């Protein structure tokens with residue numbers, strides 16, 4: 001295919017993130033060489049989920065994103081069967097052992113307002129906490145409970161805007177923006 | 181022997197846990213290739229003991245389980261001879277430098293209620309703290325003092341239920357359950 | 361060139377610091393083999409900046425010094441575009457996610473009093489926090505807010521005086537002092 | 541020489557401790573192959589000093605023991621010239637950046653009472669904090685200020701008694717005891 005977006009994704013993100021995103025897309029019938037915008041988004045979503053899990057105390061989070069579908073659901077079942085929390089219909093991204101709730105992390109190129117609306121209406125488990133990040137430095141969380149402290153969330157916002165700058169410097173941002 | 185339980189234990193637990201469990205069983209005249217249920221249980225008990233020791237503050241715990249019998253008793257003697265705590269008749273699993281007591285960690289396929297009864301009656305040192313975990317997500321500790329915080333114990337419960345699911349998915353749980 | 365200062369810098373600082381200082385000087389048209397005093401100063405400034413970033417809590421600081429000019433400004437733009445802080449005219453050394461301000465770290469062979477005066481007058485962004493260290497063990501910070509706790513700053517002062525002793529023992533301090 | 545004490549020291553302590561003790565003894569005209577009791581004591585003293593430095597918060601301690609005489613005094617001079625603390629006449633073992641004092645750590649086979657007396661009378665700098673450990677599990681510190689918390693000191697006491705047991709099991713304790 002020879003996409004410019006593909007070579008930028010491989011130099012922007014670390015090899016473990018790229019490998020997990022490639023495996024995730026292929027598992028769902030998506031090709032990272034063609035759907036290069038989806039390739040960038042899944043890497044971005046993966047890195048955001050991992051910085052998020054690094055922001056709290058040790059042992060605080062259980063990472064669901066980044067596993068295969070079967071093993072991700074297996075850990076969800078164990079979390080539900082040991083904490084009594086209701087089983088979510090869709091795969092979440094983390095579990096907060098402190099607040100005892102699942103977290104769905106979103107990363108959007110639109111307003112954080114409209115994307116949360118889509119995710120809140122998509123998921124039926126109203127117990128699942130939602131936390132949205134934008135590429136412009138905005139965020140929005142369920143009940144205005146942002147889970148982490150200010151500095152951990154600020155790192156994610158800074159990293160997101162750096163990716164945007166790197167994309168625009170290569171004339172790839174406009175195609176990435178009008179693709180969500 | 182060629183046991184399905186053997187190959188699952190080697191892929192479920194990390195190689196250091198398997199090696200320590202193999203050495204522990206052989207030291208007591210048990211063969212991991214035949215007593216494959218005991219092989220799974222000792223690996224599970226070993227991993228639970230190590231996650232437990234990782235749950236507290238640094239330097240808080242002294243790990244007794246996972247050593248050879250002679251060296252495990254040597255550290256117990258040093259702990260007793262330096263803290264004044266009475267020497268337990270049976271080998272415990274950890275020592276809590278914070279609460280100044282030995283901890284016996286149990287992992288059961290039955291009710292956490294009955295297993296503690298067996299361990300409390302087995303040990304005569306009533307000073308030794310007892311902490312039981314089940315594969316269903318229940319726990320029970322001496323004086324209702326669970327030592328660690330909620331999230332460290334929840335990780336162990338989640339991990340235990342994941343092992344149960346992995347066993348049942350391979351049709352090995354029923355033999356493991358009716359073997360304790 | 362065969363400078364004694366060059367061989368001391370390579371044995372005093374760790375190879376990653378030397379490599380970053382060499383790249384920084386060459387990027388600005390300076391040669392570490394000739395401008396050996398500048399070579400020592402940039403290594404010292406780099407090490408001080410990194411010990412500083414290690415002094416606070418995790419995630420607290422964003423390191424700007426030690427990057428290439430383009431990437432350093434790219435992260436600054438993301439920090440400004442996500443926190444609303446005004447863009448500084450000159451490249452700072454760190455960003456404090458806790459106090460929400462940029463930090464300019466200085467290391468001087470003169471009085472900490474006069475060097476801050478030069479840096480305060482050089483920078484127009486009065487929001488940028490200034491923190492000066494001397495080779496004699498003195499420090500001076502904006503609004504007397506020294507950011508870190510006492511022990512993290514004391515380590516830097518101790519390290520600075522050790523470098524001075526190592527220089528004087530090799531008869532290189534006097535040339536280094538009367539060069540700033 | 542072929543000493544039993546020599547081979548036990550090499551299997552009891554980690555190779556970095558043995559190497560530092562060997563270098564320390566040779567620097568003072570002592571041979572680890574002959575003065576095997578001194579070899580064991582210097583390894584024990586070195587390990588105790590390092591567990592001690594690991595007991596406090598990060599950045600809290602500056603390790604003086606384990607360096608060459610010239611570099612150990614160079615760091616002492618920098619600590620004194622930056623904190624204003626008086627220069628000790630004899631090399632201490634650590635510096636407490638929290639309490640702003642040097643620490644002399646002793647390890648004795650006699651009563652902690654008599655050994656402190658020798659060290660307090662040896663050193664003239666009454667500012668230098670003294671902390672003694674015994675192989676029986678006793679300790680004694682200046683002004684009853686034990687610096688670290690209870691659990692960090694208990695680890696050192698446990699480790700000391702384990703070394704004693706390992707020595708006595710090899711019939712080397714009695715020669716080690718009546719050698720101090």
Ligand SMILES: O=C1NCCc2cccc(c2)OCCCCOc2cccc(c2)C2=NC(=O)C(O)C1=N2
Pocket residue numbers: 024025028030041042045065091092093104105106107
């Ligand atoms: O967890 C998730 N799993 C999805 C795995 C996946 C990978 C590749 C293709 C695909 C599914 O099909 C897309 C189905 C229609 C959904 O449209 C999108 C588009 C882009 C991102 C997301 C969803 C998304 N955002 C998140 O925040 C997530 O957590 C999350 N997906």
Ligand SMILES: O=C1NCCc2cccc(c2)OCCCCOc2cccc(c2)C2=NC(=O)C(O)C1=N2
Pocket residue numbers: 204205208210221222225245271272273284285286287
């Ligand atoms: O510490 C322990 N050391 C035992 C070492 C050992 C290994 C292999 C065989 C064996 C002994 O013989 C069994 C003797 C009869 C005891 O029956 C069992 C069966 C299964 C687990 C345990 C005990 C057990 N549960 C714990 O919780 C422990 O801590 C613990 N053992």
Ligand SMILES: O=C1NCCc2cccc(c2)OCCCCOc2cccc(c2)C2=NC(=O)C(O)C1=N2
Pocket residue numbers: 384385388390401402405425451452453464465466467
């Ligand atoms: O961030 C910085 N970037 C400068 C990068 C650089 C490297 C090599 C040569 C050069 C610039 O040209 C010098 C231009 C005139 C400035 O004179 C000096 C001399 C010595 C140190 C500094 C400035 C300095 N002190 C700091 O504290 C800094 O943070 C800092 N520089």
Ligand SMILES: O=C1NCCc2cccc(c2)OCCCCOc2cccc(c2)C2=NC(=O)C(O)C1=N2
Pocket residue numbers: 564565568570581582585605631632633644645646647
């Ligand atoms: O720091 C120290 N540096 C000494 C370096 C050294 C190594 C080998 C031989 C030697 C000196 O000559 C001995 C001179 C007479 C002193 O007798 C002893 C005997 C055994 C231990 C100590 C002192 C001692 N105890 C501590 O606690 C220390 O801190 C400490 N030494």
Ligand SMILES: [Mn+2]
Pocket residue numbers: 065091092093
């Ligand atoms: Mn997801």
Ligand SMILES: [Mn+2]
Pocket residue numbers: 045093104105106
């Ligand atoms: Mn998500």
Ligand SMILES: [Mn+2]
Pocket residue numbers: 245271272273
């Ligand atoms: Mn046990």
Ligand SMILES: [Mn+2]
Pocket residue numbers: 225273284285286
């Ligand atoms: Mn047990």
Ligand SMILES: [Mn+2]
Pocket residue numbers: 425451452453
């Ligand atoms: Mn700078």
Ligand SMILES: [Mn+2]
Pocket residue numbers: 405453464465466
């Ligand atoms: Mn600077």
Ligand SMILES: [Mn+2]
Pocket residue numbers: 605631632633
């Ligand atoms: Mn000493």
Ligand SMILES: [Mn+2]
Pocket residue numbers: 585633644645646
């Ligand atoms: Mn000493």
